[PDB]
């Protein structure tokens, strides 16, 4: 026999197959919740591969009897109770560096779509709006703004935020960031303005973009209180986590005009629909379905790394042989 | 500039 | 009495009013063609302000009896027979530097929309596509590509093309250009690869973007012959002039899959419709209605400069007092 | 790379 490794919330293992064939038994559950997982997997499985569509609480984790390693195929690991997994002896790993520039490229696309109205102008043209005179060009593209001199505020200057910052310079954005965990010096090295409080960023930014991981202290970071601290007619971009923005507060802000437009790749409740939830047809909203990370290369890249992390777990030592373990402190 | 001051500061 | 200056294809003169009130009589025609212009204007008018929606041939120009100056409110002047106007003694001016970065920002938005599928993913989400698993994320965003290492080909490295080039560097694009009129050295100063023939650009570029003015020699630059020289599954962006691309050839290429996607702000026949013309529902097409230049600041900026060019014509000397005359050689 | 050679060269 050889250790069982299961893909919890997927059906495809074609990319992982050549890396695990000889060291692990590969199965998949295609499960939305821990309820749909076969009793065998809970008892036998030593390894687990998962994405973002399944949440693992402390309850779910202590149903597993042989589980020693969880690898998240992708960056964020908020959907995994990493503290609880450490108590039980389960190492948690991620793949942080696979779709950094993909995400930054999609974020810049979102920013620009709000500023230049490319998506809404296409939408208008789809719906049979006729534009003849210069007067009606100005009318249909009303709100399109000049970028140079505008202030882009970045919340969380990690991998993605840093890549967004570099790209933003080229357009003429005045770039400032807020990151309470980075040590002094990053702002000087990259040549960016830095502010010390969230309100300070909100007060100065014409366009606010989110690039921080979802944690204990930042849930509903953009709420009823903090939305008011944002400038009149500011843009909001969120390609980080949906649980960071209060959708009820955002909706209200969009209708009243306090936020001129929003671009969302992530939402509080996924899958997203324009019919379901608080964002039920708020004006000036652009939404993509958690696809900012995607490209074939990035998808293969993270799956191969994830598969390699599994192999390192089975053959070598936990948590030594591991490369991208995110709960060494909880073990 | 283009944008105005926050509703409550 | 004081000289008559008419806005040919518009109805609004509010921005020009404070600059011309004391030196010129201001009227407007709101005309699509020379046919709708009042007989008085043809006889009396010394000055003319116009946009892109009206074409002036040699026929139209020799109906004017007192016309001495035409100012185009905007960059391109292909819709004005500049050679013929010079023969008659009519100075032609433009406003070249008002919406350079606006256009480059919209172009970059178009490029990115093709690469990251932001508009099409939003369109999908508008039309009630449900995306739950990672499998269907990859499916709906199929064709989304990694930018770094890709080659962006620029045709015409003028004001806009140069600004596009600088922005493209930040994303990881390998940037090359083709411009048969620029002298040797521009490529070294800006740090860009340069090719000598149109086919050479077409052979190497994964994404082709257009930034040249419409002239005598480049009409239907992208035709049935040259489309074949483009790479299999290449992107096409055109924010320059619609008369540069054969829409019949583009349509055929888009359906067959030889061109993976196209983003158009300009078209052969304007206004554009998804029902009228050769692009009658070709797959993977994004269209905006000649709105790449637009922003309130840019719109005011060019109108004030245009109004100042009129004033310089009436008070000072033709073509000396003029600032942006484009037919000194034809006078 | 991602894109292939032109149909006719
Ligand atoms: N939309 C998508 O398809 C997709 C793709 C990639 C990443 N993401 C998400 O976006 C995030 C991007 O971050 P990254 O990949 O650069 O990881 P990262 O760790 O490099 O960046 C996170 C940074 O944010 C900072 N931070 C944490 N909490 C903060 C808070 N309360 N306020 C301000 N800053 C805070 C941290 O100091 C850290 O440096 C990920 O956490 C991931 O969840 C989503
Ligand atoms: N889409 C819009 O709303 C909008 C806005 C701005 C400009 N435009 C158009 O796009 C063009 C942008 O050019 P610009 O503003 O940088 O002007 P520009 O004069 O600075 O750029 C034109 C350059 O293209 C080169 N060129 C001319 N013919 C060429 C050809 N046959 N092949 C390759 N290169 C050629 C010239 O040498 C010149 O340097 C304008 O001519 C204008 O017509 C459209």
PDB file of C-alpha atoms and ligand atoms in Angstrom, chain C residues 75-76 78 99 103 155-161 178-182 211-213 215 218 221 239-241 265-266 290-293, ligand 2:
ATOM      1  CA  UNK C  75      -5.274  64.987 -33.411  1.00  0.00           C
ATOM      2  CA  UNK C  76      -5.922  63.331 -36.803  1.00  0.00           C
ATOM      3  CA  UNK C  78      -7.145  62.593 -42.567  1.00  0.00           C
ATOM      4  CA  UNK C  99      -5.263  63.447 -25.332  1.00  0.00           C
ATOM      5  CA  UNK C 103      -5.425  57.445 -25.710  1.00  0.00           C
ATOM      6  CA  UNK C 155       2.943  50.313 -35.900  1.00  0.00           C
ATOM      7  CA  UNK C 156       3.825  54.015 -35.778  1.00  0.00           C
ATOM      8  CA  UNK C 157       5.928  55.274 -32.875  1.00  0.00           C
ATOM      9  CA  UNK C 158       4.604  58.837 -32.656  1.00  0.00           C
ATOM     10  CA  UNK C 159       3.164  60.511 -29.563  1.00  0.00           C
ATOM     11  CA  UNK C 160       0.667  57.788 -28.590  1.00  0.00           C
ATOM     12  CA  UNK C 161       2.789  54.792 -29.669  1.00  0.00           C
ATOM     13  CA  UNK C 178       7.847  49.735 -37.134  1.00  0.00           C
ATOM     14  CA  UNK C 179       8.028  53.360 -38.297  1.00  0.00           C
ATOM     15  CA  UNK C 180       9.481  54.076 -41.782  1.00  0.00           C
ATOM     16  CA  UNK C 181       9.535  57.870 -41.256  1.00  0.00           C
ATOM     17  CA  UNK C 182      11.414  58.270 -37.949  1.00  0.00           C
ATOM     18  CA  UNK C 211      -0.737  54.196 -33.775  1.00  0.00           C
ATOM     19  CA  UNK C 212      -0.134  55.730 -37.205  1.00  0.00           C
ATOM     20  CA  UNK C 213      -2.075  58.511 -38.919  1.00  0.00           C
ATOM     21  CA  UNK C 215      -2.355  58.765 -45.154  1.00  0.00           C
ATOM     22  CA  UNK C 218      -1.416  53.102 -45.558  1.00  0.00           C
ATOM     23  CA  UNK C 221      -2.668  48.436 -44.191  1.00  0.00           C
ATOM     24  CA  UNK C 239      -7.174  53.061 -31.719  1.00  0.00           C
ATOM     25  CA  UNK C 240      -5.635  54.968 -34.609  1.00  0.00           C
ATOM     26  CA  UNK C 241      -7.868  55.050 -37.706  1.00  0.00           C
ATOM     27  CA  UNK C 265     -12.072  52.144 -30.944  1.00  0.00           C
ATOM     28  CA  UNK C 266     -12.032  53.245 -34.573  1.00  0.00           C
ATOM     29  CA  UNK C 290     -14.202  56.529 -30.821  1.00  0.00           C
ATOM     30  CA  UNK C 291     -13.814  57.340 -27.108  1.00  0.00           C
ATOM     31  CA  UNK C 292     -10.140  56.541 -26.415  1.00  0.00           C
ATOM     32  CA  UNK C 293      -9.228  60.243 -26.428  1.00  0.00           C
TER      33      UNK C 293
HETATM   34  N1  LIG E   2      -9.029  56.596 -31.041  1.00  0.00           N
HETATM   35  C1  LIG E   2      -9.071  57.903 -30.744  1.00  0.00           C
HETATM   36  O1  LIG E   2     -10.142  58.457 -30.010  1.00  0.00           O
HETATM   37  C2  LIG E   2      -7.959  58.804 -31.199  1.00  0.00           C
HETATM   38  C3  LIG E   2      -7.310  59.606 -30.266  1.00  0.00           C
HETATM   39  C4  LIG E   2      -6.036  60.100 -30.535  1.00  0.00           C
HETATM   40  C5  LIG E   2      -5.417  59.789 -31.745  1.00  0.00           C
HETATM   41  N2  LIG E   2      -6.064  59.004 -32.667  1.00  0.00           N
HETATM   42  C6  LIG E   2      -5.452  58.643 -33.963  1.00  0.00           C
HETATM   43  O2  LIG E   2      -4.319  57.827 -33.745  1.00  0.00           O
HETATM   44  C7  LIG E   2      -3.141  58.407 -34.254  1.00  0.00           C
HETATM   45  C8  LIG E   2      -2.131  58.480 -33.118  1.00  0.00           C
HETATM   46  O3  LIG E   2      -0.947  59.086 -33.575  1.00  0.00           O
HETATM   47  P1  LIG E   2      -0.220  60.229 -32.711  1.00  0.00           P
HETATM   48  O4  LIG E   2      -1.244  61.021 -31.990  1.00  0.00           O
HETATM   49  O5  LIG E   2       0.872  59.593 -31.937  1.00  0.00           O
HETATM   50  O6  LIG E   2       0.378  61.135 -33.901  1.00  0.00           O
HETATM   51  P2  LIG E   2       1.918  61.050 -34.369  1.00  0.00           P
HETATM   52  O7  LIG E   2       2.121  61.876 -35.582  1.00  0.00           O
HETATM   53  O8  LIG E   2       2.802  61.502 -33.266  1.00  0.00           O
HETATM   54  O9  LIG E   2       2.160  59.499 -34.734  1.00  0.00           O
HETATM   55  C9  LIG E   2       2.116  59.038 -36.070  1.00  0.00           C
HETATM   56  C10 LIG E   2       3.414  58.313 -36.402  1.00  0.00           C
HETATM   57  O10 LIG E   2       3.149  57.204 -37.240  1.00  0.00           O
HETATM   58  C11 LIG E   2       4.108  57.131 -38.280  1.00  0.00           C
HETATM   59  N3  LIG E   2       3.507  56.566 -39.512  1.00  0.00           N
HETATM   60  C12 LIG E   2       2.816  57.238 -40.490  1.00  0.00           C
HETATM   61  N4  LIG E   2       2.434  56.354 -41.439  1.00  0.00           N
HETATM   62  C13 LIG E   2       2.866  55.126 -41.085  1.00  0.00           C
HETATM   63  C14 LIG E   2       2.748  53.879 -41.691  1.00  0.00           C
HETATM   64  N5  LIG E   2       2.357  53.800 -42.958  1.00  0.00           N
HETATM   65  N6  LIG E   2       3.302  52.770 -41.084  1.00  0.00           N
HETATM   66  C15 LIG E   2       3.970  52.903 -39.881  1.00  0.00           C
HETATM   67  N7  LIG E   2       4.085  54.146 -39.286  1.00  0.00           N
HETATM   68  C16 LIG E   2       3.544  55.243 -39.877  1.00  0.00           C
HETATM   69  C17 LIG E   2       4.652  58.542 -38.471  1.00  0.00           C
HETATM   70  O11 LIG E   2       6.030  58.497 -38.769  1.00  0.00           O
HETATM   71  C18 LIG E   2       4.398  59.219 -37.133  1.00  0.00           C
HETATM   72  O12 LIG E   2       5.593  59.306 -36.375  1.00  0.00           O
HETATM   73  C19 LIG E   2      -3.503  59.785 -34.791  1.00  0.00           C
HETATM   74  O13 LIG E   2      -3.014  59.946 -36.102  1.00  0.00           O
HETATM   75  C20 LIG E   2      -5.016  59.859 -34.764  1.00  0.00           C
HETATM   76  O14 LIG E   2      -5.538  59.772 -36.071  1.00  0.00           O
HETATM   77  C21 LIG E   2      -7.315  58.515 -32.400  1.00  0.00           C
END
